[PDB]
Structure 1
Amino acid sequence: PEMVRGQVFDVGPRYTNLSYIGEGAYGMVCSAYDNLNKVRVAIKKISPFEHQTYCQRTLREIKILLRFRHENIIGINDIIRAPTIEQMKDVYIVQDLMETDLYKLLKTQHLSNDHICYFLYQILRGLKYIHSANVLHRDLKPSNLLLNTTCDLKICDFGLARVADPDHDHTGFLTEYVATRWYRAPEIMLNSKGYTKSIDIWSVGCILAEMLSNRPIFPGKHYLDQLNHILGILGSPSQEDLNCIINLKARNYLLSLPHKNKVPWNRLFPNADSKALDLLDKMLTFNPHKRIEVEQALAHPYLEQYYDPSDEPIAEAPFKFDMELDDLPKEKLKELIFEETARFQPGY
């Protein structure tokens, strides 16, 4: 049993020579050597069993990744856990190892317009497959976009992913949210639970802006500050976009603000490709009903040298409904995680 940052990684003997590569609230990621396939891999230790919320998220992440197979999406190669429910303290997901992430890359490197175009194409190609499966990623950000030296990109971290539920998306003003602040769509703070595909498109728009300048476009200092940054650039929403906001607290908040004019994309990004800024504008649309969809984004003139719908696959088996796991206790969720991972066990 190897040890990384005071965390036991019970993955042997197949997986050895571990090294820290990432973290979350209830998990840790390591790189390791796979003695069977003779390659280095990424291993994610998930420790969710003490919290019901974490158990729901674990079962979703596993179920989703086991169904998905796409070049621009991190897959599951193996799942390690103890042979019995009693002995199962953690769950280890084995994934292909990637060299870096877009967050690490943007901290140090200027991207050429060809690199932005290629990385954006891959994000949208992977996102087309996810949305085609009736799934929402809900935490797209640069650290969840993995890269190698040949510029291949893979979307990772489906820990907050859900089946889309547009009929149950409505909520109140400033209602609590999980996903990362800077990549949060304005409707999250206003009237959305983030159960529609347009949530992911906003995050992609924030990522594109960030690839263009190496700086987050909307860097809210805290939860409440986020809408200030968005409206600071986009300007006051139109009468038509306000009439779509029917909860009075959110509407009246927006109506109380002094008029703010739109900051043109060409002033924020004076070196950017005019086609890239046109697509950015359509992704960073205030009204989610007017926001560009993934298949429209792929067909945008900015991506014309890559666009090929016959080479942009969709999911063979989309998820029909979400799982109703909210009332299920963490002990019952532990059982479903055990049953979902059974196929990877020796002597199965």
Structure 2
Amino acid sequence: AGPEMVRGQVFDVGPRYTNLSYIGEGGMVCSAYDNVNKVRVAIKKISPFEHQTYCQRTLREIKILLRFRHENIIGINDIIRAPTIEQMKDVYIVQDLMETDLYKLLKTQHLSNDHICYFLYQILRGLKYIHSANVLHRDLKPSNLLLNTTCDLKICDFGLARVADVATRWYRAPEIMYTKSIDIWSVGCILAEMLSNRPIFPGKHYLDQLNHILGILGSPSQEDLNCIINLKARNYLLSLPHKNKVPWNRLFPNADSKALDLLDKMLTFNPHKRIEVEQALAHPYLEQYYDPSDEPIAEAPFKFDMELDDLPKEKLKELIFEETARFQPG
């Protein structure tokens, strides 16, 4: 029958994966029937060989998700690519099929405080495991939080993930305009969005993003501004007129006072004064779900065998070909 196709684009995943149907982009992402495990799966087509940045982003995700094994993190079941390096133009990552994402859910559904509390717990449960491995997600947002029929949550897209030592603007920490705290900020933005079904900081650009943050948190203090900050960004925020702090209960008068207290501690301008993943799970708002016994952590910190940023384009393609060879027949 030949290689399969979806919306005028090759999707050569057959004969194992058949009956394809489009979902979205991230390249193209489809659902497919697996003839071996007799279930429908998710398949992400990646075409990254034009740019060295897309190759290292693809390699980092594969290496991280193959090492990671946690209920609140999407794994990798299979990887399809050409039998020879010359013909390898694409990489197909096969993962578990989820019903929806948090972006599509919040666009059509109102969440009860109980559902908000359970989603937040699972995000922080999964983040606890990520952070214990000394890994930063760097792009936590509603579209990266997959959900199943029974409301179970999984974190996906580890392309922008780096080892602890570019992102979606709305959920991007002020310090970026680096460390584990940037992911807490992003979870803060996700919590605020779950409470009102709209983004708390919808900036059109980097400047508008900062103005939206200051519009709620108020003008930053001397200690907030004092850091290894961008000279242009510092002078801009100093030139801006005074902005008053909007109390959290004024933005979400409906919301649980415990949910707001946690949101305040997560949406802290200063990343050093910001709440960490453990103290966040231990917060009185999440006591119904907090269980240190059933919250696994990584065995050892994650580390790359080599500096991927220094490797030339050709060696990077060979590494992708080598890392994916384990899923080849042989």
TM-score (norm 2): 0.96
What do the CA deviations read for 1:19-69 (whole angstroms, capped 9, x no partner)? 111212xx2211000000000000011110111110010110110110011
1:200 Cα shift? Answer: 0.5
CA shift in 2, pair 1:321/1:48, >3 Å: closer
Contact 1:31 1:97 (C-alpha < 8 Å) held by counterparts? yes
Indicate the residue corresponding to 2:23 in structure 1: 21
Contact 1:75 1:95 (C-alpha < 8 Å) held by counterparts? yes
1:245 Cα shift? Answer: 4.9
Identity, % of aligned positions: 100
- In 2, the alpha carbon distance for the partners of 1:242 and 1:88 equals 48
What do the CA deviations read for 1:249-271 (whole angstroms, capped 9, x no partner)? 33333222211111111011010
Q: What's the secondary structure of 2:195's corresponding residue?
A: helix
Indicate the residue corresponding to 1:245 in structure 2: 228
Indicate the residue corresponding to 1:170 in structure 2: none
- In 2, the alpha carbon distance for the partners of 1:234 and 1:156 equals 30
What do the CA deviations read for 1:237-257 (whole angstroms, capped 9, x no partner)? 112222235554333332222
- In 2, the alpha carbon distance for the partners of 1:78 and 1:253 equals 48
RMSD across aligned C-alpha pairs, in angstroms? 1.3
1:116 Cα shift? Answer: 0.1
1:3 Cα shift? Answer: 1.1
- In 2, the alpha carbon distance for the partners of 1:292 and 1:241 equals 15
Q: What's the secondary structure of 2:125's corresponding residue?
A: helix
Following TM superposition, the consecutive aligned residue runs of length 4 or more in structure 1 with deviations greater than 6 angstroms are none
Q: Out of 248, 252, 259, which is 1:276 matched to?
A: 259
Indicate the residue corresponding to 2:65 in structure 1: 65
1:224 Cα shift? Answer: 2.5
CA shift in 2, pair 1:11/1:321, >3 Å: closer
What do the CA deviations read for 1:133-160 (whole angstroms, capped 9, x no partner)? 1111111100000001100000011111
- In 1, the alpha carbon distance for the partners of 2:9 and 2:233 equals 44
1:323 Cα shift? Answer: 4.4
Deviates more, 1:314-323 or 1:233-242: 314-323
1:281 Cα shift? Answer: 0.4
1:322 Cα shift? Answer: 8.0
- In 2, the alpha carbon distance for the partners of 1:200 and 1:7 equals 35
- In 2, the alpha carbon distance for the partners of 1:3 and 1:299 equals 48
- In 1, the alpha carbon distance for the partners of 2:25 and 2:159 equals 12
Q: Which runs of 5+ in 1 are unaligned?
A: 165-177, 190-194
- Please list, as runs of the form range in 1=range in 2, the aligned pairs for 1:129-278 lying within 5 A after superposition: 129-164=129-164, 178-189=166-177, 195-245=178-228, 247-278=230-261
- In 1, the alpha carbon distance for the partners of 2:69 and 2:229 equals 40
Q: What's the secondary structure of 1:213's corresponding residue?
A: coil
CA shift in 2, pair 1:313/1:53, >3 Å: same
Contact 1:245 1:251 (C-alpha < 8 Å) held by counterparts? no
CA shift in 2, pair 1:199/1:322, >3 Å: farther
CA shift in 2, pair 1:321/1:47, >3 Å: closer
1:321 Cα shift? Answer: 5.5
1:17 Cα shift? Answer: 0.5
Contact 1:163 1:322 (C-alpha < 8 Å) held by counterparts? no
- In 1, the alpha carbon distance for the partners of 2:136 and 2:228 equals 22
Deviates more, 1:83-92 or 1:54-63: 83-92
TM-score (norm 1): 0.91
1:315 Cα shift? Answer: 1.0
What do the CA deviations read for 1:173-210 (whole angstroms, capped 9, x no partner)? xxxxx110100111111xxxxx2001111100000000
- For the pair 1:328 / 2:311, whether they are aligned, the reply is yes
